[PDB]
């Protein structure tokens, strides 16, 4: 079962009272079973002189100090590669529409921005930094991190930027502490994660008065002994973003791939429904 | 990991050097012939000295120069060793005695010496500069790594 809490850690959590200190653009808390996932989205302003992605920093807590494990390295890249290849975030959606700030001599403070100019252009660009914390891990956790990141990306607000008259001394370019616009991403490309496994069990079963497949791998027992696995990122439109297959313990029949596609599609329907409500 | 050499080898090679002889049948002042092969792309070069095989790849990308040097571009040389050249080398061991020496020899021979015109790597002063990178790949080892790398 999956239960989430979106926009709880963001600065845009409350409409009336906005956090002046918090720099989180979008957030998501997720817990599937025992494993808990906490995603926070931050940003940056970059000058610019087809689709892009975000830069995730996953921290899986196992209770050991030291550098980043090979797990955290691969996941950070796998999240970055999948988003980049699933075409979720276009480079045009990250374009910064700036503005101007003209100040009266204590008479007034004026800020002006134009919608029309940006459409004509159709130029600072936004960059989305992500950090994903994982608590209480119990198995393959890439899917959990992906789903939490997807829900977090569904709700991201990009604050507008502007500069008070300045000369190319030191000049500080600033964003607005209030005004912001919602991030526009392709919902048609939005996918969700799920894992599957293939194994054979010898043991006989008693009776009282041919391959088998397991969905959503958890527990050490399944992660350790099941060497034939399938990973899917599926979309509600029914377009599929990616597919991970590796058989190391048993043969992978085409009939099992089809079930996974059906299983993955069903998961996408379930996840999609949750987002709507 | 420490390589094992027989006492018999250590006595044989040492005695052979006193008789002006060596295993690969060379002289004392002789340098093994160097073979240079260029790839399809520019900056792709393969240097071979006997069994010693090294490969270098030159690349560059638009970057911004340091505040201290607004007229100079960026230039770095990478020589990370790998177990491919032999199991004697630890993967990513960039602090070992021989590794740091080799890294410093190349740097003082190319970087510090100003073999490359870093001033000509500047596009717009204090704003945009080219960043040339020299990546050396030690494919296999039969000695002479420093000589192979400089070439």
């Amino acid at each position: 079962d999956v239960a989430i809490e979106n926009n709880t850690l963001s600065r845009y959590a409350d409409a009336g009272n906005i956090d002046t200190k918090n720099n989180i653009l979008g957030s998501n808390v997720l817990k599937s079973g025992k494993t808990i996932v906490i995603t926070s989205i931050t940003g940056g302003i970059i000058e610019e002189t087809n689709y892009a992605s975000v830069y995730p920093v996953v921290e899986v807590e196992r209770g050991r100090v030291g550098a980043c494990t090979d797990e955290e390295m691969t996941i950070s890249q796998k999240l970055h590669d999948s988003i980049l290849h699933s075409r979720i975030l276009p480079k045009k959606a990250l374009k910064v529409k700036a503005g101007v700030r003209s100040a009266n001599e204590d008479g007034t403070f004026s800020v002006l921005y134009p919608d029309e100019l940006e459409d004509d252009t159709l130029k600072w660009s936004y960059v989305l930094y992500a950090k994903i914390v994982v608590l209480s891990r119990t198995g393959p956790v890439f899917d959990l991190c992906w789903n939490s990141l997807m829900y977090a990306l569904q709700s991201v607000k990009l604050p507008r930027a502007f500069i008070d008259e300045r000369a190319s001394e030191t000049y500080e370019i600033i964003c607005d502490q209030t005004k912001s616009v919602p991030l526009m991403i392709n919902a048609k490309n939005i996918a969700f994660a799920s894992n599957y496994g293939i194994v054979e069990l010898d043991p006989e079963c008693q009776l009282q008065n041919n391959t088998v497949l397991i969905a959503d791998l958890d527990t050490e027992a399944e992660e350790t002994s099941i060497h034939s696995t399938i990973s899917i990122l599926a979309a509600p439109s029914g377009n599929y973003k990616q597919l991970t297959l590796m058989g190391g313990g048993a043969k992978i029949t085409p009939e099992m791939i089809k079930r996974s596609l059906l299983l993955s599609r069903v998961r996408a329907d379930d996840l999609s429904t949750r987002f709507n409500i | 990991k420490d390589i094992e050499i027989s006492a018999s080898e250590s006595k044989f090679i040492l005695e052979a050097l006193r008789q002006n002889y060596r295993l690969d049948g060379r002289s004392f002042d002789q340098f093994r012939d160097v073979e240079i092969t260029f790839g399809k792309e520019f900056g792709d070069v393969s240097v071979k000295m006997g069994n010693t095989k090294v490969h270098c790849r030159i690349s560059c990308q638009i970057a911004q120069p340091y505040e201290d040097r607004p007229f100079e571009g960026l230039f770095v040389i990478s020589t990370e060793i790998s177990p491919m050249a032999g199991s004697q080398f630890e993967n990513g061991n960039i602090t070992g005695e021989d590794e740091v020496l080799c890294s410093r020899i190349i740097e003082k021979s190319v970087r510090r010496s100003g073999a490359l015109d870093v001033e000509g790597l500047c596009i717009v002063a204090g704003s945009k500069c080219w960043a040339v990178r020299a990546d050396v790949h030690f494919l296999d080892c039969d000695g002479g790594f420093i000589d192979a790398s400089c070439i």
Binding site: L9, S40, G44 | -
Partner: protein, 213 residues
């Protein structure tokens, strides 16, 4: 960086009634865990404490246990790493009196405290001091939940930047943290934090009874 994905290095970051909620034993990855949420006025703090141990150290000849505490930034990057180490050193100076070390020879207890969030509202025409009593509350709960023997319940309070931790029903002190604020608040802060201690203590004891039940 070849370890993580820091993105473009030529870019720049963004430039612009006491209430308690206690929950323990919600993490199956460690031996003991705790969740502490406090909301006062416009200021609220939520942190998670994870305990791993006691686990045997090979070759260790120590006749007692060894405690290690580390604070982490869960979301908002506010507190300096240098300051996090300072509090950690302060926290370990407290629980080394609280934890019965004689029970775990040749062993070590690692304590991870994740400061996932703190929300600060400041009006316009120290800082980490207020979080300290909540960190002590979280750890003492996580240790007691883990099964680690504690000589007494550790608790604290924050009064005008002056933090002081109590055990044995406020009769003695296991930690003292004073930054800035004002002088001659010695007697006052000791009395105000003692009330916060007793309040935090009973809720901590009730917490274990509830979840344990």
């Amino acid at each position: 960086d070849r370890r993580r994905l820091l993105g473009p290095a030529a870019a720049k970051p963004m430039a612009f009634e006491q209430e308690l909620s206690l929950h323990t034993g919600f993490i199956e990855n460690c031996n003991g865990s705790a969740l502490v949420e406090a909301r006062s006025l416009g200021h609220q703090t939520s942190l998670i404490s994870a305990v791993y141990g006691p686990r045997s150290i090979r070759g260790s000849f120590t006749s007692q246990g060894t405690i290690s505490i580390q604070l982490k930034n869960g979301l908002l990057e506010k507190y300096n790493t240098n300051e996090l180490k300072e509090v950690s050193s302060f926290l370990m100076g407290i629980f080394n009196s609280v934890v019965n070390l004689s029970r775990y020879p040749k062993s070590g207890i690692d304590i991870f405290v994740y400061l996932t969030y703190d929300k600060d509202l400041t009006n316009n025409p120290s800082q980490i001091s207020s979080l300290i009593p909540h960190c002590i509350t979280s750890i003492t709960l996580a240790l007691a939940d883990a099964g680690i023997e504690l000589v007494d319940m550790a608790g604290a309070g924050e009064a005008n930047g002056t933090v002081v931790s109590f055990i044995k029903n406020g009769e003695e002190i296991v930690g003292f943290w004073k930054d800035d604020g004002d002088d001659e608040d010695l007697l006052e802060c000791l009395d105000r934090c003692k009330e916060q201690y007793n309040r935090y203590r009973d809720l901590m004891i009730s917490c274990l009874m509830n979840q344990e039940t």
